[PDB]
Amino acid sequence: IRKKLVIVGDGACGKTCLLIVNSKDQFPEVYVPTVFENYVADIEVDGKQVELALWDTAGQEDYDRLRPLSYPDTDVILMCFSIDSPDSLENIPEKWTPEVKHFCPNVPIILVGNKKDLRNDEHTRRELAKMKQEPVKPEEGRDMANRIGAFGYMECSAKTKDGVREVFEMATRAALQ
């Protein structure tokens, strides 16, 4: 059984790390932005062997002309933001949801809050407080998921591995529905 997952969301919000930890089981140490790449994850869910194609994309607005090449025949969208970036959450309804709803009508969206480990990181909190902001709270992520009509909301950290397997299990269930 073959299904296609596309991941989108702001530049540097943790998309590639999420995909790599899920598949290769190892956190990448390079700081390198993605243009496009494809991976495969074999996942068994509810007795079914799924070959899940993972399409990785660039979050930079510069790539807005190219990103739609990824969208055809998509079965599930992971729409990501970073917990350490309230701006990346605000960009969910302002930019990502309009694009995904346009090119992926009626495809289930999992809203994913990345870098959960930074929510209480002292450096992060002080950097955000300087700018009158704070890390995204769980209720805020959930509220946004409800607002955009997501299939679910999940938080994860690619760095600690927390929540990662659960993101892709949920995504696979959504893809099979």
Partner 1 sequence: GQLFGISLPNICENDNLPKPVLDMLFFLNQKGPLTKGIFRQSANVKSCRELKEKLNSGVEVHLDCESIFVIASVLKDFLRNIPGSIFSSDLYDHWVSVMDQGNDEEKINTVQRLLDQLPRANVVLLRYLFGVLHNIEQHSSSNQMTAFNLAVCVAPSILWPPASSSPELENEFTKKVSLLIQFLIENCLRIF
Ligand X SMILES: Nc1nc2c(ncn2[C@@H]2O[C@H](COP(=O)(O)OP(=O)(O)O)[C@@H](O)[C@H]2O)c(=O)[nH]1
- Interaction between residue 158 and ligand X (CB under 6 A): yes
CA triple 79-80-82, angle to 5 deg: 165
CB nearer to ligand X: give 18 or 50: 18
Please, what sign has the CA dihedral across residues 103, 108, 151, 170?
negative
Is position 33 an interface residue for ligand X (rule: CB under 6 A)?
yes
- The C-alpha atoms of residue 23 and residue 150 are separated, in whole angstroms, by 24
Size of the site for partner 1 (CB under 8 A): 25
Partner from ligand X, Mg ion, partner 1, none contacting 152, C-beta within 5 to 8 A by type: none
Does 163 contact ligand X by CB under 6 A? Answer: no
Q: How far apart are the first and last CA of the chain?
A: 13
Whether 80 and 9 have beta carbons less than 8 Å apart is answered as yes
Closer of 14 and 86 to ligand X (Cβ) = 14
Task: Give yes or no for residue 27 binding partner 1 (CB under 8 A).
Answer: no
Q: Which of 12, 45, 53, 176 binds ligand X (CB under 6 A)?
A: 12
